[PDB]
């Protein structure tokens, strides 16, 4: 089958099966060795059995899903924190149906903010500093104001 | 000088991708082991 890069796909390189994102690598392999492993003995690079091109294997995006809620007694509005992922990857996985949680938060614009803890959807980022009410991470906190 | 550790790295475990990793049969078999996943997740959240 044809080669697809920069996309989470199920690959099979001469019996080596797995899932991940294939990208162009700068690793200079030797002619006899085919696939590479890191210190933890996980496959991080392979060669094309036909093109002989070295491709980096990056695992597909995953992480924890955290829900920020002011409490049922206050409101039913919630914010979702996709931990450890860029907002662009979440937008791509929402535009095309690839994200595991079937529910999707409505991106109304200016409500998708990128934090160092992950992508925050459902809350707007203000420039005013307040006391931390709901700890999100990396110095960012949420509140219902 | 006096150096004292204050905190350590906060770690989270999926408890399913580690044991199974996108395997449905493995997940169905792990569902029969009880709430060990929940206990591990709760302990890690408490540590964090």
């Amino acid at each position: 089958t044809n080669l697809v890069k920069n996309k989470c796909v199920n690959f099979n390189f001469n019996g080596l099966t797995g899932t991940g994102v294939l990208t162009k690598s700068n690793k200079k392999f030797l002619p006899f060795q085919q696939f590479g492993r890191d210190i933890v003995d996980t496959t991080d690079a392979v060669r094309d059995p036909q093109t002989l091109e070295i491709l980096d294997i990056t695992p597909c995006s995953f992480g924890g899903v955290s829900v920020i809620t002011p409490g049922t007694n206050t409101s039913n509005q919630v914010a979702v924190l996709y931990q450890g992922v860029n907002c662009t990857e979440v937008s791509v996985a929402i535009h095309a149906d690839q994200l595991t949680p079937t529910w999707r938060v409505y991106s109304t614009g200016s409500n998708v903010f990128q934090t160092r803890a992950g992508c925050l959807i459902g809350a707007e980022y203000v420039n005013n500093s307040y006391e931390c009410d709901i700890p999100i991470g990396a110095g960012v906190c949420a509140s219902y104001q | 000088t006096e150096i004292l550790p204050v905190s350590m790295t906060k770690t989270s475990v999926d408890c399913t991708m580690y044991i199974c990793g996108d395997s449905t049969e493995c997940s169905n078999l792990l569902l029969q082991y009880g709430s060990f996943c929940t206990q591990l997740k709760r302990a890690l959240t408490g540590i964090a």
């Binding site: 160092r116 110095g139 | 770690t11 989270s12 991708m17």
Partner: peptide, 21 residues
């Protein structure tokens, strides 16, 4: 000097609440 001296299958590292700053 202290900052300069002190130098993935389901395992996620959570960032601290308070940043170094």
């Amino acid at each position: 000097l202290l900052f300069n001296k002190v130098t993935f299958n389901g395992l996620t590292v959570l960032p601290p609440l308070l940043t170094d700053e």
